[PDB]
């Protein structure tokens, strides 16, 4: 709240996962702290009952040059992924999210994966 930037704050609080459940699909908008960046090529996100999802619709950020990955699309603050269902059924679905990235300070955090159960609540947050 008073900062949310740099490497002074741990990843557990450096990310604000705002879950927006709509009628068309599920939109996950996690606010990334100013200093951390995630790899769009390693971001895992999917929600469906029995694998009835079309495809993970990313918003696409900017390309980041690298020494090992060469260059990939990364998110440094902006993060929005929409999950459109391929089946229109009022069934309960699970949400699998995996946050993988690194910090510009030379810190490499593991892909903290959190699975959520969509039973109907609107907003969702990890119970850590």
């Amino acid at each position: 709240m008073a900062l949310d930037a740099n490497d002074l704050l741990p990843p557990e609080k450096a990310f604000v996962p705002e879950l927006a459940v709509a009628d068309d699909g599920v939109n996950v908008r996690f606010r990334i702290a100013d200093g951390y960046y995630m790899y769009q090529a390693k971001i895992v996100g999917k929600t469906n009952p029995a694998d009835l999802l079309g495809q993970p619709s990313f918003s696409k950020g900017e390309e980041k040059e690298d020494e090992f990955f060469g260059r990939q699309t990364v998110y440094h603050h902006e993060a929005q992924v929409a999950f459109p269902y391929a089946k229109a059924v009022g069934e309960p679905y699970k949400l699998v999210l995996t946050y993988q990235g690194s910090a510009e300070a030379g810190v490499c955090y593991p892909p903290v994966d959190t699975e959520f159960d969509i039973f109907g609540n609107g907003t969702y947050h990890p119970q850590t």
């Binding site: 895992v44 020494e67 090992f68 690194s102 030379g106 810190v107 955090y109 593991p110 994966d113």
Partner: protein, 144 residues
């Protein structure tokens, strides 16, 4: 405490962690990620630093939890190192994250300083440096 469990920690070489957990010497557990750019470059540094005469005063080891934090599952991680370089890397396999969970490891690298009595004396989340190492040698309370 859990001394028996700590001694059950097998490395990617299939050897017990006891090889670096004896003689009443301080231990330094460093966590890392397999498929990470930053960790990849640091891997060479870990070996280089571990070979330093000054760093030979502490048992510096690299531990990873197969299957934990979405990392490589058990049976895949040890196989990964088997095809890697550096035939002298003290890589330990923490099945389930017995060490990672107990220290609430959410970000790498993680530097766990174990005292000569076999207890966690210090825990740092991030990266260390030479000046910091010297400070630790002077006072173990000199965090960050």
């Amino acid at each position: 405490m859990v001394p028996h469990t700590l001694s059950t920690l097998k490395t990617a070489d299939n050897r017990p962690a006891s090889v670096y957990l004896k003689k009443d010497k301080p231990t330094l557990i460093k966590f890392w990620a397999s498929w990470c750019p930053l960790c990849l470059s640091e891997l060479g540094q870990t070996e280089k630093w571990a070979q330093d005469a000054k760093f030979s005063s502490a048992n510096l080891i690299t531990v990873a939890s197969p299957g934990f934090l979405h990392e490589k599952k058990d049976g895949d991680f040890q196989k990964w190192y088997a095809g890697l370089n550096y035939p002298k890397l003290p890589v330990v396999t923490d099945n389930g994250g017995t060490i990672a969970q107990s220290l609430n490891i959410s970000v790498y690298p993680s530097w766990a300083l174990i005292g000569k009595d076999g207890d966690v004396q210090r825990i740092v989340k991030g990266s260390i440096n030479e000046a910091q190492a010297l400070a630790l040698i002077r006072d173990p309370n000199a965090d960050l």
